[PDB]
Design a protein around this ligand. Structure first.
Ligand SMILES: [Mg+2]
Ligand SMILES: [Mg+2]
Ligand SMILES: [Mg+2]
Ligand SMILES: [Mg+2]
Ligand SMILES: [Mg+2]
Ligand SMILES: [Mg+2]
Ligand SMILES: [Mg+2]
Lengths: 131, 262, 141, 185, 58
RNA sequence: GGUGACCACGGGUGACGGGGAAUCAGGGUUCGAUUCCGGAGAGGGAGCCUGAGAAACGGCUACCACAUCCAAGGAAGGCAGCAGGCGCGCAAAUUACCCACUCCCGACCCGGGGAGGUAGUGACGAAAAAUAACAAUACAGGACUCUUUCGAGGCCCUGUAAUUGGAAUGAGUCCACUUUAAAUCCUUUAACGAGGAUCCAUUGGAGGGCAAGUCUGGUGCCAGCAGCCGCGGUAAUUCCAGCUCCAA
């Protein structure tokens, strides 16, 4: 924490997705890769925002420690951040849930429903028996 | 095949799209539109690879579906809409306008224009035919056709289409001594003046063009777009004024720029 | 002499492709009868079943009993004779073994003092003869 | 199908005839004098010089004032004087044919640290580079075959994390210290 | 068959089995190249012999 | 009538064509099943509906060859798609995860995609690159020097072997971060981690071609080696071994 610094570059703003995006590098001379949460709040202090709208990813560390570079994303509002931002990053921040079944099981149910025609009760009870 | 193709491999994409090899297997495959897919710039790569407003196809799809991209004064939500030559791309939320013009190396460059200049657009007439009730027509280099043109307008001349009306306000005849631009082939992107036109019946006419620096080249007639009345262009030219300069005088320009910046 | 006219290319190429049939390598590689006569059928290696164990007398200046196996190939059922190339590797060979046989060095020609033998055993029962000779692994009892 | 590239090339050529005393002795002399691991990484620099000389000879066969000849000649001379194997005043295609593989081997990082004196021998230089002790500018380099340019020549120095610049002594030093303090109060 | 296969492996059978002498490991790679460069490139011998080979059986 | 020694016609192809690949003075000679373009096919043929587009086969109809269920009255088939089996073979991978990327389809910002992406097997092949470095003692060597061989150290470079002898690191264990759809791997980074540093480099050779032994012990024209010359019939530079050397 004593020697960790954020530096921004390729900064630009767009109103198309209502955000400002940049590529940043953080300097840890002798420490591990800085945690994305730490980048989040430090960049929030940098741009006078809160560490709930900050979005960072793609942090690759140069050979031999020291510099690591990632792509930073800041939005004007959390509602816009929810509106246009990938669901996996929303789930990383905990704002999106993926509590669903496997792709294989989903395909099994989709193919089993094709054997039953029209009848709504037998079309919704298709996957009830072969669990 | 048993029908039309609706895929485009990444390596088989047009070279001027400046796509790489490792991102994926496929290319945008632009939808049918006013321009052929060989010389069109789809909006996905225009807003992802040229301006970096979007990082992915999904993001550029969101940008398009929020109805901010305006092409030729009309809102287009097609992610792979073929933009093409000198169609005005207007974004009002961020307030800039783009004119899609080839650079000196035959690639669509990011050319920014004022709104009062973006209000209009040059077109190259491709055919003139009279239709029913004796009504003349005019089909441009786009898919755009219009009725009741000036009878002085002939084939492969230039017309001034102002947006939001689709009408003609002025025109440039294809005449010796007029400023042109090459729209295909090796000399793509070169601004020059019509010096000669040799015509070969039953084949393609060849036009000889000299630029400002005196470099004279030639190209087929179908690759020429008249852009100026004599020597003043009717549009805003990109950087370099469409003057193709060789690698010998490109390298030392790079060295001078590096020396100035260092 | 040879013709040198500007439009003699037809005669030059015709004479070349006629005369190219007179050397043994081109004839062997392009006639196909050598490919038909080859027991391996143009393959580097082959598999077979050991029909018998035989001894072959060496040539005139030498005097030895080269140890070979009479082997029927699994494909096309052709019967060949394959040398067993080490000091005691015939003992690792028994009847009805599935042996792998390769060429014996010079492309379907006999090598050394062994008359009419063009193949050698590389593996027996899916274990290498080199491995058995060096004792690095054992026969599959 | 797959979006790979599979564009690769070999970097060395084996000699046409093996087992000749003159070539074997010359290659062994080079290996011993420059601290190379094997014959592959001297055939590699020989191949590089062969490619450079082939390009220079072909350019020489091109006519004078030919713009392709001029452009590629200045490019090749610029690269050669950046890597430092050619003097800045010898900007001619004829002098490229006069180069030798010793000039290229002298520009290796392994040789350069030994010449600068960061290591006591060429083999010590190689192991010192491999154990992440040598840095160029700010990047640490663990590749002995790192060709050093003239601008990067001055910026070769010990790494900060290594126990030769900054602190943090090695594991054996720390173990010896803790054993010593556990033996003596 | 004429019956001469009974002698297979005869000499390898009769050869007395002597074990390999346990020896120090040999340097490999760059160290090996350094060693064999030092042996035959940096040395001065005052003895005659007309440049005898590296495996002299003196 | 039309075509043919300017090679028609017929036959063969272990022939899909091309962009290209190997080799590399120049000229050429071989290879292109294989990711890009074009063509053809969906077990073999044949015929069709629909549709803008199919003679479609993850559409239909019939025959042939296989082949599934059957209550024997019938009914249902097409992996040269992704995986995965059997067979054939000298010969070729996991019945994994995901639509996160590139794009495609649809009424469509929202769904779907074994296209494709990711991981697993992977010495096909290509790039980089560990298996050690340094110092001090003995015994040598140097254009070494100090008195002119004699003796030594004001120096340098090897090898032999040691209580040396304390410095540097990984390969591995492994916390966290990072990566990522989620992981993995790489790069970071805690803590352990080297003195037969036993944390052990192999594959082929030592008559010539062709670098390397006229060493030693067995065998005795036998066993075997040997691409070719040739070696072996009791003193083997060539076999089987030990040691020592050679090449990568
Ligand atoms: Mg065929
Ligand atoms: Mg092909
Ligand atoms: Mg194809
Ligand atoms: Mg078909
Ligand atoms: Mg069909
Ligand atoms: Mg090892
Ligand atoms: Mg021996």
């Amino acid at each position: 924490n004593d020697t960790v610094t954020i530096r921004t570059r390729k900064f630009m703003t767009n109103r198309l997705l209502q955000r400002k995006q940049m590529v940043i590098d953080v300097l840890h001379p002798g420490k591990a890769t800085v945690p994305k949460t730490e980048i989040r709040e430090k960049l929030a202090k940098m741009y006078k925002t809160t560490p709930d709208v900050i979005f960072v990813f793609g942090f690759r560390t140069h050979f031999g420690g020291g510099k690591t570079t990632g792509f930073g994303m800041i939005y004007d509002s959390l509602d816009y951040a929810k509106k246009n931002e990938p669901k996996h990053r929303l789930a990383r921040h905990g704002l999106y849930e993926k509590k669903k079944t496997s792709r294989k099981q989903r395909k099994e149910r989709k193919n089993r429903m094709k054997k039953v025609r029209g009848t709504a009760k037998a079309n919704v009870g298709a996957g009830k028996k072969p669990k | 095949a048993r029908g039309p193709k609706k895929h485009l491999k990444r390596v088989a994409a047009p070279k001027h799209w400046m796509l790489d090899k490792l991102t994926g297997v496929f290319a945008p495959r632009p939808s049918t539109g006013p321009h052929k897919l060989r010389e069109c710039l789809p909006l996905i790569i225009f807003l992802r690879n040229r301006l970096k407003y979007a990082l992915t196809g999904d993001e550029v799809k969101k940008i398009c579906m929020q109805r901010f991209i305006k092409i030729d004064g009309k809102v287009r939500t097609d992610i792979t809409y073929p933009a093409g030559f000198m169609d005005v791309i207007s974004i009002d939320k961020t307030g800039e306008n783009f004119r899609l013009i080839y650079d000196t190396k035959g690639r669509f460059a990011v050319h920014r224009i004022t709104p009062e200049e973006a209000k209009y657009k040059l077109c190259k007439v491709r055919k003139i035919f009279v239709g029913t009730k004796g009504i003349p027509h005019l089909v441009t280099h786009d898919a755009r056709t219009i009725r009741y043109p000036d009878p002085l307008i002939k084939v492969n001349d230039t017309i001034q289409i102002d947006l939001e009306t689709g009408k003609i306000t002025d025109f440039i005849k294809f005449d010796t001594g007029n400023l042109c631009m090459v729209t295909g082939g090796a000399n793509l992107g070169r601004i020059g003046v019509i010096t000669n036109r040799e015509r070969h019946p039953g084949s393609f006419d060849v036009v000889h063009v000299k630029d400002a620096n005196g470099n004279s080249f030639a190209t087929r007639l179908s690759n020429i777009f008249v852009i100026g009345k004599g020597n003043k262009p009717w549009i805003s030219l990109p950087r370099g004024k469409g003057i193709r300069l060789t690698i010998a005088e490109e390298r030392d320009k790079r060295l001078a720029a590096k020396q100035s910046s260092g | 002499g040879k013709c040198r006219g500007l439009r003699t290319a037809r005669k030059l190429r015709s004479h070349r492709r006629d005369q190219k049939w007179h050397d043994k390598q081109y004839k062997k590689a392009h006639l196909g009868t050598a490919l038909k006569a080859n027991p391996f059928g143009g393959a580097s290696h082959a598999k077979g079943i050991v029909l018998e164990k035989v001894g072959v007398e060496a040539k005139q200046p030498n005097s030895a009993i080269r140890k070979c196996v009479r082997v029927q190939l699994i494909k096309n059922g052709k019967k060949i004779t394959a040398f067993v190339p080490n000091d005691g590797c015939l003992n690792f060979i028994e009847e009805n073994d599935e042996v792998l046989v390769a060429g014996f060095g010079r492309k379907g020609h006999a090598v050394g003092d062994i008359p009419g033998v063009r193949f050698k055993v590389v593996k027996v029962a899916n274990v290498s003869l080199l491995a058995l000779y060096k004792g690095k692994k054992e026969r599959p009892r | 199908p797959v979006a790979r590239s599979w564009v690769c090339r070999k970097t060395y050529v084996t000699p046409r005839r093996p087992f000749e005393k003159s070539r074997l002795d010359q290659e062994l002399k080079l290996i011993g004098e420059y601290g190379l691991r094997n014959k592959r990484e001297v055939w590699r620099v020989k191949f590089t010089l062969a490619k450079i000389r082939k390009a220079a000879r072909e350019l020489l066969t091109l006519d004078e004032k030919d713009p392709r000849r001029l452009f590629e000649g200045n490019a090749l001379l610029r690269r050669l004087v950046r890597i430092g194997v050619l003097d800045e005043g010898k900007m001619k295609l004829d002098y490229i044919l006069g180069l030798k593989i010793e000039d290229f081997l002298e520009r290796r990082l392994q040789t350069q640290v030994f010449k600068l004196g960061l290591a006591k021998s060429i083999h010590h230089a190689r192991v010192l580079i491999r154990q992440r002790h040598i840095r160029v500018r700010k990047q640490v380099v663990n590749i002995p075959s790192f060709i050093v340019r003239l601008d990067s020549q001055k910026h070769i120095d010990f790494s900060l994390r290594s126990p030769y610049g900054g602190g943090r002594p090695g594991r054996v030093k720390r173990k010896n210290a803790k054993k010593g303090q556990g033996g003596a109060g | 068959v004429h019956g001469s296969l009974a002698r297979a492996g005869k000499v390898r059978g009769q050869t007395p089995k002597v074990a390999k002498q346990e020896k120090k490991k040999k340097k490999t790679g760059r160290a090996k190249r350094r060693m064999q460069y030092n042996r035959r490139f940096v040395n001065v011998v005052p003895t005659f012999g007309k440049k005898k080979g590296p495996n002299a059986n003196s």
